[PDB]
Every structure is written in structure tokens, then in C-alpha cells.
């Protein structure tokens, strides 16, 4: 008997990564972008995309030769073998989805409360935060597959709303409000925000952890990554220009929960405000459905077992059911211990260390996968610099959030050495070799 997985086409994989990227930036941290970057936000999204494309250079080179549902972990193991670092990075990869759920949790509430006229409490937000995570945990048992089939349709609808937001957003604008502020008292904020908005291009995760469930992976994994980054880059900027141009920046800081919902009111009314708020929840729900069922489930099973099943359903929690509750538990927890700006900082920090190890892997395997050494040196220094800029900012901005970021990297390394002593779990070439 030979089983076969249901496999994704190029555009299915693109829609998947685009949906996750959009849900994490357009409807999640756009209100954070107003407070820090301000009018430099459209320039921020470009600069953020630059780092991503540098990361993509290593991913697309490694993903062209190495096929695995392990993703980065596969590449990393091929370079540095099995050890405590490889295992920490696997748990770190799982944690990247965990904290992502916290970011999607906050975003969902930001657009939901103003829709039904509810005050912005620490408690009234928290009710939605626990609730929405509980809804997607319960979805595992009846609806996870059905929502996953709708994801492609939802992404398009969410895109079409944004596609009308630009075409009809470039009408009653303030071209004197979109002019890039060149004064270094607000320029450094653009570069500091680009360290946070690195997460805006988190498409690497969902794609690489589904690489064995994608048609012609050696070809379509690189392409999906490359196409995904270039699409959202145009979407971010085109919406960023419109949002700043139609609304005063001080009104955007106080509407940090819903940045675009209030932005639609002046030039589309409450009917246009209704269309944004509805299409927001749908976009964040489908992004989370993708993160839990396709990413978190895969990341957890690999971190726990040391390998992955050859044949599994992507759109359910296919193995180790306790992992679903644990992932959901920390998903709510992070959305409580930290704020909208707090969650985003951690998420971006986790990803950068994964990418840094991906770049380091590309360096080591450059004989096998190919590439230009001097570009493989360049992006490494860039990402590290951006990673340091995020730590530098957080230390001089938020004490409470700064230590939360530091604790993560230690707590992951502690858990690894402990877990490796208890279970003796090893990682092997099983991840990418066959048969």
C-alpha cells in the first residue's frame, strides 16, 4: 500500500502565506505602526520587505534542494547536525506560532468591539482574547477542515476589500500628509519600526512546514516564498499610503486597536466602516486557522518527536492532542502578559534568530545548494543588526517587554536540555532524505 498526501498547488501555497502575512500586519499591528513610524510607515513596509528578501535568498536556495515538512529545522540539521542548538530551534519554531496566535488574538478584538459598540477595557479585550482562542481549539473537533477549504476564498475577499481600499483610497487624499518626514527626530522611528514589522513577512513558516504537502516542492517552495513577499509588499504600501493620507496621525494612535476601520469612515462612511470590520475578522480567522492547522501542529510534533509523519492531514491537530491545548494556553497567556506593541516585538525577535540560523546554514552548505558567499555574509549582518536594533529599542522603551524577550530564548534553551535528558530525542536525516 502506498498512501499519498493531499497536495497544494503553487497559488494555494501563495494564498496561504499571503493570508497569514496580511492578518499579522494589515489587521493586527497597523495601529502600532502609527505610534512609532507615523507618516514613515509606507517607507517602513518597504524597508521591512528588504530584510525579508535577503532572508528569502537563503530560504529559496535551501528550499530548492532540501524538501521537508521540518522547514528551517531540516536546513539547520543538514548544516550543524543533531544537537542542543537544533532542538532549541525546533521548540523556537513552535514558539513562533504560539506567539503569533497571541498577535492574531489581539487583532481580532481590535476590530470586533467597535463593530458592536463595546468599550476598550483590559478585561473586555481579554474576554475576546480567551474566547477566540477557545473557538479555534474547539474548531479542531468539527470545523477545522471546512474553514481550511474556505481559506482561499476568504483571502481573495480580504484582498478585494483592500483592492477597493487603494483604487478608491487615492481620491480624497492629503498629498501633504503622505510626504516622507525627513527630520531625524522621526526617521529613526521608521528604522526601529522596520525591526518590528519584520514579522509582516512571516510566510516562510506556513510554506516550509507544508513543503512536502506542496506540488513540485523543489520548484514551487522557492516560488511561493518569492511571490508571497512581493504581493504583500505591494499591498502593505498601497494601503499604508491611503490610511495616512485620509486620517490625521493623532486619531490613529488613539485607534491603535482598529487603524483601518476608523480610516474608512471619512471617505466611505459607516457602511464602508462596516465592510472593513467584517472583512477584518474573516482575514484574521483564516490566518490563525492556517497558523494552528498547518504550522503549529507541524512545529509541535517535530519538536516533540524529532521527526514528522510521512502521511498526515494538515488541517487538523493530527498528532499529540495535548500540544493543541498547550499551544492554545500560551497563546492566551502572551496576549495577557504583553500588549499589542509587546506581542509584536517578541514575534519578530523569535523569527530573526530562526532566519539567522537559516542564513548560517546556507553559508555552510553553499557547496551543495549554491549561492554568492558575499550576499550570504551581507544578509546575516543585516538581520543581526536589525535584531540588535529591536533589543536596543525595547531596552530604552519597555522594560517589561524587554525581559519577556530575553526570557524566551533562555526558557527555550532550558526546556531543550531538560527535554533531551528526559526523552533522549534525536534529530536525523529522516526529515529530508527519503525514502
Amino acid at each position, epitope marked *: *500500500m502506498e498512501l499519498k498526501n493531499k497536495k497544494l498547488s503553487l497559488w494555494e501555497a501563495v494564498s496561504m502565506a499571503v493570508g497569514v502575512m496580511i492578518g499579522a500586519s494589515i489587521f493586527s499591528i497597523f495601529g502600532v505602526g502609527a505610534k512609532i513610524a507615523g507618516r514613515n510607515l509606507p517607507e517602513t513596509f518597504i524597508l521591512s520587505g528588504i530584510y525579508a528578501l535577503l532572508v528569502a535568498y537563503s530560504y529559496t536556495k535551501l528550499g530548492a534542494k532540501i524538501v521537508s515538512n521540518a522547514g528551517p529545522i531540516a536546513f539547520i540539521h543538514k548544516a550543524i547536525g543533531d544537537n542542543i542548538i537544533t532542538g532549541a530551534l525546533s521548540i523556537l519554531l513552535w514558539m513562533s506560532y504560539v506567539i503569533s496566535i497571541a498577535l492574531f488574538a489581539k487583532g481580532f478584538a481590535g476590530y470586533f468591539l467597535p463593530l458592536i459598540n463595546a468599550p476598550i477595557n483590559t478585561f473586555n479585550i481579554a474576554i475576546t482574547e480567551i474566547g477566540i482562542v477557545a473557538f479555534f481549539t474547539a474548531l479542531n473537533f468539527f470545523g477545522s477542515k471546512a474553514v481550511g477549504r474556505a481559506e482561499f476564498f476568504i483571502v481573495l475577499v480580504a484582498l478585494l476589500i483592500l483592492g477597493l481600499f487603494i483604487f478608491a483610497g487615492l481620491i480624497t487624499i492629503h498629498p501633504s500628509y503622505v510626504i516622507p518626514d525627513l527630520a531625524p527626530s522621526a526617521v529613526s522611528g521608521m528604522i526601529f519600526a522596520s525591526a518590528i514589522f519584520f514579522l509582516s513577512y512571516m510566510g516562510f513558516g506556513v510554506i516550509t512546514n507544508a513543503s512536502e504537502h506542496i506540488e513540485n516542492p523543489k520548484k514551487n517552495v522557492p516560488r511561493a516564498i518569492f511571490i508571497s513577499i512581493l504581493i504583500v509588499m505591494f499591498v502593505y504600501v498601497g494601503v499604508a499610503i491611503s490610511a495616512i493620507g485620509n486620517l490625521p496621525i493623532d486619531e490613529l494612535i488613539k485607534a491603535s486597536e482598529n487603524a483601518l476601520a476608523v480610516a474608512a469612515k471619512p471617505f466611505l462612511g459607516n457602511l464602508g466602516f462596516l465592510l472593513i470590520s467584517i472583512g477584518a475578522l474573516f482575514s484574521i480567522s483564516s490566518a490563525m486557522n492556517a497558523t494552528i492547522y498547518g504550522g503549529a501542529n507541524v512545529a509541535y510534533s517535530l519538536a516533540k*518527536d524529532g521527526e514528522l*509523519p510521512e*502521511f498526515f*492531514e494538515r488541517k487538523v491537530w493530527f498528532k499529540s492532542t495535548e500540544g493543541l491545548y498547550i499551544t492554545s494556553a500560551l497563546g492566551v497567556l502572551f496576549a495577557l502578559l504583553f500588549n499589542m506593541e509587546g506581542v509584536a516585538s517578541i514575534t519578530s525577535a523569535v523569527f530573526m534568530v530562526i532566519y539567522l540560523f537559516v542564513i548560517l546554514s546556507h553559508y555552510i552548505l553553499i557547496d551543495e545548494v549554491g549561492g554568492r558567499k558575499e550576499i550570504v555574509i551581507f544578509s546575516f549582518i543585516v538581520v543581526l543588526g536589525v535584531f540588535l536594533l529591536l533589543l536596543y529599542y525595547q531596552w530604552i522603551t519597555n522594560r517589561f517587554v524587554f525581559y519577556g524577550i530575553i526570557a524566551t530564548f533562555i526558557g527555550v534553551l532550558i526546556f531543550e536540555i531538560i527535554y533531551r535528558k528526559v526523552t533522549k530525542r534525536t534529530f536525523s536525516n529522516n526529515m529530508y532524505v527519503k*525514502s
Partner: antibody
Amino acid sequence: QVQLLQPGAELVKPGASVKLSCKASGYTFTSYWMYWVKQRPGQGLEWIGEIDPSDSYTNYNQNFKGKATLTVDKSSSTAFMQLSSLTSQDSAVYFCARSPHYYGTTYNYPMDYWGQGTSVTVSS
Amino acid sequence: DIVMTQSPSSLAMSVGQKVTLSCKSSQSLLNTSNQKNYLAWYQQKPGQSPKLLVYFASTRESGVPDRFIGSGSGTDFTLTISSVQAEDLSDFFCQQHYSTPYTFGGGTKLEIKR
């Protein structure tokens, strides 16, 4: 190409234990179930139990819940069945057999590849 | 626990004849969602391990001769050998692969008549 290596025969004294081995090659050991099957000479087949070699999860036939214990060695792709307190009623051929495992789904599968079997004699 | 019953225990058929092996289950083996019947057939020659012939009631296993056809539904199932060849003498077992305590039929022994 895909094969399961079991030793031919085993002689063991009554009341003692025996550990039977099933070495797997040609496929990824942890991606499939490992089942064990009992057959008495000239009679039918009994399913003893299943092990998931990835996490060593086990599920037993009620009639074997104290007689048989299933373990694996991931590193060497080998499955073991421990048989305890052996009587003459345990004199049989014991097969290991692979079964496909499609994880997050409603499909269960039969046994597509079998070992040659280990015939266990329990005698003084 | 599902009990599997095969009838008869043994039959004799001559080379070229059509053989019909019957197998019944205590419970329906049809899963009404994703609608397949979880029944397998095995062939066991003397001294050898069992060989999977058919799974999910109707699909032949890779490498199995055309002569072997599985059919049936719910609680009643058939294995048909369209035309028996001398080397087909063996013990045929059905097995449900529906729910965890997997169970076999007592087998049907096929001898070649001459």
C-alpha cells in the same frame, strides 16, 4: 524492497520470558504502525496489538494485556515484543506486520508487509 | 468487538472454475462519512506469512493478479477468483480494519480438485 526481519525459531522454558525482534528496512520505521499477530499451528490469526514507533504509544488486544509488551528501538528501526510467563498455550508463530498510518484522519489500514514469523516453542 | 465469520471453512474447486469466498461481520464495516468499507483479504500459503490481496473491500493490492476481485458492502463481503489456477491452493482470511481490536475470520481453506 520493504522487508521485516524476524528470527526463525525460539526455544524457551515454561514460566520464562522471550523478547522477539522485528527489524525494518526499505521504509521510514516511525511513519507506520507496527502490529503483532499470533498463529497457532493449523489455526487462525489473532491480532495482539499495535505500537506507534514515533512515541511508543501502545494499544493491546484485551486477551494479551498481561502477556505481551511492545517496544521499539528508533535508532535501529527495530520493534520488540516481550512475552511473559510462558505456557504451552504460547507455543505459536508470531508475526510482526506493518500498517499504514494516516494521522489526522478517519482511515484505518490492514497489514501490507509481514515478517516471516518467529515460531516459539515453550518446552522443558 | 467485531466478529468475522467466513463460510464455508473449506471448499474444493478444479482448475479453471470460478471461486466465491464469503465473509460476514458482526457490525457494519461501512463508514457513512467518507464512504468506504474497512475489509481486507489475505492469502496464506503453507509455511508462509499471510499476503494482503484486497483492502477497503474492493481495491486490489499492488502486484496481485486480476483473478482476485473483492466486493460486498456493510456486513456481507465476497472474494471472487474469476478462474482458479493450480497454485491458488491456500488459506484465505478476511480481516476488518475498522476499529482498534482488529479481528480475522477463521479462514477458508481452498483445495484444488482434480
